[PDB]
Amino acid sequence: SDAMTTFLQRDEFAVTARVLGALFYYSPESHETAPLVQALLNDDWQAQWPLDAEALAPVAAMFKTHSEESLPQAWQRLFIGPYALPSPPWGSVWLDRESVLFGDSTLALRQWMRENGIQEPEDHFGSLLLLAAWLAENDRHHECEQLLAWHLFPWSSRFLDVFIDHAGHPFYQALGQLARLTLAQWQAQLIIPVAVKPLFR
């Protein structure tokens, strides 16, 4: 490392948070993400992602792996309904004893946001990554690390493990794996430790 390469690489965190967050937040047909989806399905991108090539290669291939289920079918099944979601992408599902939306962990996140002047529940996996990206982009690094350590990482690894195991569409399995690898890199570099919180699901 040196100061020049570090500065030139400043956007690695935020851009990867934005990609991962968007792909969990928006439908794969959205104007926001369809071009990214198309590139993951068809094009050469992995060299530009800030992970080791050996770790990325299987993931890039998994994105391109065929299913008879369409991406819009999978998105609906995984994130919308009507049947229970295999891995619901909201923090309070994992961190609240009753496993509801707008739970106690959601309120803890809200309080933290309010005390730091930061402004549908807020604890969606994709929403939290998009918020982390915004914080990093606006030079609020201390706050970004608290968001990750206290409000995302206590549940994200569990959510991702279940999602990867049960997604059942290669595109979304790959997205889960990419997120797991990327967030693990971030966790390993965090200045402060992850809050250890009970997980109920």
Q: What DSSP assignment string belongs to 37-102?
A: HHHHHHS--GGGSSS-HHHHHHHHHHHT---SS-HHHHHIIIII-SSPPSS--BHHHHHSTT--SS
Structural domains in the chain, CATH included, are 1-201 (1.10.3480.10)
Q: How many CB atoms lie within 10 A of CB 78?
A: 22
C-beta of residue 175 within 8 angstroms of C-beta of residue 63: yes
Q: How far apart are CA 150 and CA 163, in angstroms?
A: 21
Q: How far apart are CA 103 and CA 95, in angstroms?
A: 8
| 72 CB-contact burial (10 Å; exposed 0-12 / middle 13-18 / buried 19+) | exposed
Helix (H, G, I), strand (E, B) or coil at 124: strand
* Nearest partner of 126 among 9, 189, 33, judged by Cα: 33
For residue 131, what are the contacts with CB-CB under 8 A and spacing of at least 6?
118, 122, 147
Residues forming a β-bridge with 124: 90
C-beta of residue 178 within 8 angstroms of C-beta of residue 167: no
Q: How far apart are CA 21 and CA 60, in angstroms?
A: 17
For residue 170, what are the contacts with CB-CB under 8 A and spacing of at least 6?
62, 63, 64, 65, 66, 67
Resolution, given in Å to one decimal, reads 1.4
Longest dimension (CA), the chain: 51
Q: Method used for this model?
A: X-ray
* Nearest partner of 178 among 87, 70, 73, 52, judged by Cα: 52
Q: How far apart are CA 72 and CA 169, in angstroms?
A: 11
> Which residue is it, tokens 């991108």?
45
Q: How far apart are CA 117 and CA 102, in angstroms?
A: 20
Query: In this structure, what are the phi and psi dihedrals at residue 9, rounded to the nearest 5 degrees?
Result: -95, 15
- Paired tokens of 98: 């009753």
* Nearest partner of 96 among 123, 130, 132, judged by Cα: 123
Q: What is the DSSP letter of 140?
A: -
Helix (H, G, I), strand (E, B) or coil at 165: helix
